Design a protein around this ligand. Structure first.
Ligand code: NAI
Ligand code: NAI
Ligand code: NAI
Ligand code: NAI
Lengths: 332, 332, 332, 332
């Protein structure tokens, strides 16, 4: 007479549920699943929705996650090619589209991914008009600009995963040189998540001790041992990892979960993520690139005004120019 | 031209957070702070409000928690004698009132505590019309009933901590006899939180093996395993600990946090908490007793139907009459 | 006069950590990385070593994890084709080998995988003479036996993941029928990891209530609740997911991490993993099958004695003969 | 015939356990229990031992914790006035002795607490000669010196909880002024955990932006709004909280757990804790006070060399002098 009927007696009317913290991940490839597992691992969603054009793959992924439910704290995991499954998401993570082939610039993916975005972004906003969108697909800064224009969402609700990842890499490498935890090394990689990123040497410090003060040659061509190479390693890292295993995913998955945690827990932590920087540091157009931003439940609510050195501002502007040159010709 | 103005540039123009995962703990005594710290430890609240009539102690408890903020994930902690600080809480935990003296029964506190609740409950609902209330103060089953009536809330939104603690103690004691983790021990203490709780022997098992089937004398006075002594120990628990350190708090604090987790994570896990059992097991009055109940974001949405023996039913009935005998003379 | 020399003043003269909570994952395929990321997510290792014959992929997996270090609590991650990087591990997880093709049985991989293990197992014990080994590779019960023999380790230090995953799936499926969290559902799938697993119907319960007692037709072909279809679904699981996405990894990855937690935290929780069952249930050969076992810091220290029905015993025996039929012809 | 005997079948010989991560907390008053609950909350110990001269209180506390075991991951909690229960602790936390009465300097507790320490320290080292001792009792810097001399342990194994707490308070207050999470505000309070502590203004920063650069008057008498008062609030905080609730405990409990996490997880994170600073910043005697130190499994292995301003060095030396003046007359 129905398992449930007999065993479970209702105290409240049957009625409507509605996820408080529903997250959607679009794209169930390497990056998508890594974000998904990291999100689940930290119990950040009470509902996880997945979307992809590959129906079988999408279903298999859902089922595999569902089978590990005993070990998780996410009561509902759903998956469909139709965006109606993403309704009422607080956060949508977009990792859908093509990735770099070996040695390929992220900037070379632009047209293919813009085509993808033009089609899926409107479906996303239709079903969650008040969500926050975390853009991850490459090139991430330009795609965040693209998402902003297509979605019609406010700036503080369209965020590029950006240099949160580059900065974690930088902090890891710095840590390795000093023999301490990356959380105790402070340093910011800003600008494009790509070849034109900028190391803010003037802010690199341990326990408040400015490394640039200790080594005024930090970041130059005349440095003993030997910073610039550290920034070069950050720049090259995706290519080196792609050459070895075909793609990257674990670090970006962790990076994404870290941003989500700040926002779903309303913490107001600072992260270098991609936002609209017109009017900052002499940038004249609607360029998106990473700066230290404050993240909480409203999304990206603030940017940190820094006192960048002239060479730092110069490299930032150069990064802004590289990006704007591509953005400026994007067609609608 | 403040520092904040210089350092921080608003992206989305202005802060103001949408009421969300806010929790209030009423009473900042041994139990109240134990609940507060456990709620804080598991990052269950994005805002924690404290209320007590002891203004000085209240402010100091508040400050001390705040001083720990670096190590926590709750961006806002506030406290006031006035209930306006509790506005828009999702969940309110009531631990205020008088407690048992060494030896004293929980029912000796009824009158004094009915007077406390007559004041506090209407304040809670006035400022948080949509909250879930968890009642901890003793006598707990009676006060859960008093809260239900004063609150005007539907039954699924009024939960008595009931036998959640009794059962935790029971599983701990069972675990000590077997040498395994209490989470691997299963057994249910239901009914009245104190003296008259019921041990449902038929459900005591490890890995699905019925210990009663293995030992049909389980629960009788002629049992080589002395299971009845275990239940007796669960019963004398409050007493022995009160005699030793003056009160109990850590275990109940942990148990309240566990209920909150099930709810804010929408888990639909089952806990032995106290609900309105009229029309169950032959009970014909409005009384709150513990049964295995399903907790989720809406609250306590259902109860598990069990096949109870005659003597178990009888105790439940006996508890219901005793409780009703007190409740029928409660005015206003 | 390095920066490190200038910034950091040694207190206790010199670094060198005492081997402690080190874990090795052998194989960096779908399952291996899923285990790695889940182990990393729960901070189970103070050092993670990876080993695989695919040198390029191995290095890239290593780098990607390292890039995530800021978000983790594992200060050292290393990887090498050579087993010296695995020296002094407390726990070694073996997931290397060939996997099932869509449709293909787990036993079709025996020969190829026996050759893999003949090489890997002696390397593991040579570099970590005091480790605990968790076998994941298929066919898992057979390979657990092969590992026990090649390793020379006592039985409490060789654990086959066995039916830990089967049972997780089963609890998920039960939870889906009842609408509660799988942790509130109890039921044991024992015996052989694959096709021939056994559902112990007598132990399936919710809150201590026997569902079999409630539905004596549970498990037969004439059951309105279709419990046998549930078990059938647990059995077809690998198959359906493999057909959809090519392999399974997330659920097993989570389940391995859960076993490790029980062990490194010394919990003595009970899990359905595979141990040497000779002399149990009438089995007279050296074979590994899943039963409810207690895991703690020493490993798998005990097994739960159960009262099994004749048909359950018979399947267990039938599985033991089949396994033995393969194992008896294994040489060296 | 013995519950266990029948139900649980041994796989490994009965034999010896031994905690990997055993922690002892000495003193079960406000501070001791707060450290205990925070340690348990984060699953940092596989064994927790408690010691106090108050036998009944000590037992009650043990039992209360034990009753919440279902919600914890610490299989063994023991308590006794005899130090033999503390054997093989990796970490011993000493919170035993007298605390400040209202308005009383921590320095006024010195003789009474030195008497306590002279008696208990030798018992502690007898039973755990290789432990790391975290000193918390006041005055904490002087008591760390005292512990070092009495215990005969190496410097990197005797650590004063020190200014980890003052700095968290500083970061909280700073955060409140800027509207962000304390984890995103960086600033160090060093020297005595007491009235002569030192704010290192030159290291105060957000996202690497030096606040002193933005406000060169930071910390002086001619400051717009208005740092010095922030340091004053940190200095006064214990007195204000003591005046309100009688003592402090939650923040210090969290602070202590944070240090333990760094060490038991071997993270090498930086914390401002109390260590022996002879030969640093012109300090000529064996003074203990807080500086940023690197913590991992070996204890306190490194100190960070800072580039302190002349006024900062001056205040540091003044703090060192205040302390040494008391240390110098300590009698053995
Ligand atoms: N921002 C960052 O730091 C990083 C960004 N990435 C980027 O993330 C993206 C994903 O990378 P991977 O997951 O490795 O690639 P993948 O090939 O493994 O996954 C791409 C997935 O997107 C799906 N997809 C393609 N078009 C779609 C559409 N129209 N609608 C829905 N789904 C669609 C595909 O079916 C596939 O499952 C790439 O653009 C890559 O460059 C990768 C690493 C880091
Ligand atoms: N349900 C359960 O399993 C458990 C229940 N308890 C009960 O919890 C309650 C609290 O225990 P403790 O925290 O140890 O007591 P406590 O004496 O330490 O704290 C009681 C708090 O209630 C406050 N209070 C008193 N009247 C108030 C009012 N009129 N309005 C607002 N606050 C008021 C007091 O100021 C004090 O802050 C007791 O009733 C005790 O019996 C204790 C353990 C377990
Ligand atoms: N016990 C269980 O419940 C489960 C077991 N499995 C089994 O786990 C195993 C791994 O599956 P996947 O990770 O999907 O396979 P995969 O093909 O992605 O990865 C296999 C890894 O083994 C490595 N490998 C092959 N030969 C090796 C050797 N000679 N020495 C060291 N490494 C070697 C390969 O290089 C590859 O890195 C399979 O045997 C599969 O059947 C999968 C799911 C669940
Ligand atoms: N370093 C720091 O940031 C902080 C330090 N404290 C200090 O921590 C200490 C403890 O404070 P509370 O717990 O509030 O005091 P308390 O009075 O609540 O607890 C002191 C406990 O120590 C026990 N005790 C006394 N002599 C003992 C001995 N000979 N052997 C073993 N146990 C003994 C007492 O019986 C009592 O249970 C005080 O010295 C206090 O000033 C407090 C807050 C912060």
């Amino acid at each position: 007479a129905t398992l449930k009927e007999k065993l479970i007696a209702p105290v409240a009317e049957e009625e409507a549920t509605v996820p408080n913290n529903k997250i959607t991940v679009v794209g169930v490839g390497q990056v998508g699943m890594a974000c998904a597992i990291s999100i689940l691992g930290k119990s950040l969603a009470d509902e996880l929705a997945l979307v992809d054009v590959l129906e079988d793959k999408l279903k298999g992924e859902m089922m595999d996650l569902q089978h590990g439910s005993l070990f998780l704290q996410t009561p509902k995991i759903v998956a469909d090619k139709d965006y109606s499954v993403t309704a009422n998401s607080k956060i949508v993570v977009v990792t859908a589209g093509v990735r770099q082939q070996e040695g390929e610039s992220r900037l070379n993916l632009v047209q293919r991914n813009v085509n993808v975005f033009k089609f899926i972004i409107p479906q996303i906003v239709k079903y969650s008009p008040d969500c926050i969108i975390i853009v991850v697909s490459n090139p991430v800064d330009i795609l965040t600009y693209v998402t902003w224009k297509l979605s019609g969402l406010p700036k503080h609700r369209v965020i590029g995963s950006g240099c949160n990842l580059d900065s974690a890499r930088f902090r890891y490498l710095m840590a390795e040189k000093l023999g301490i935890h990356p959380s105790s090394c402070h340093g910011w990689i800003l600008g494009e998540h790509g070849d034109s990123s900028v190391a803010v040497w003037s802010g690199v410090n341990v326990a408040g001790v400015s490394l640039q003060e200790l080594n005024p040659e930090m970041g130059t061509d005349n440095d003993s041992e030997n910073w610039k190479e550290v920034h070069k390693m950050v720049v090259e890292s995706a290519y080196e990892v792609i050459k070895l295993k075909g793609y990257t995913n674990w670090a970006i998955g962790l990076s994404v979960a870290d941003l989500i945690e700040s926002m779903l827990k309303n913490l107001s932590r600072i992260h270098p993520v991609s936002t609209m920087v017109k009017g900052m540091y002499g940038i004249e157009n609607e360029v998106f690139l990473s700066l230290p931003c404050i993240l909480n439940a409203r999304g990206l609510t603030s940017v940190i005004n820094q006192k960048l050195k002239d060479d730092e501002v110069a490299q930032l502007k150069k990064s802004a120019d590289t990006l704007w040159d591509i953005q400026k010709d994007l067609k609608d």
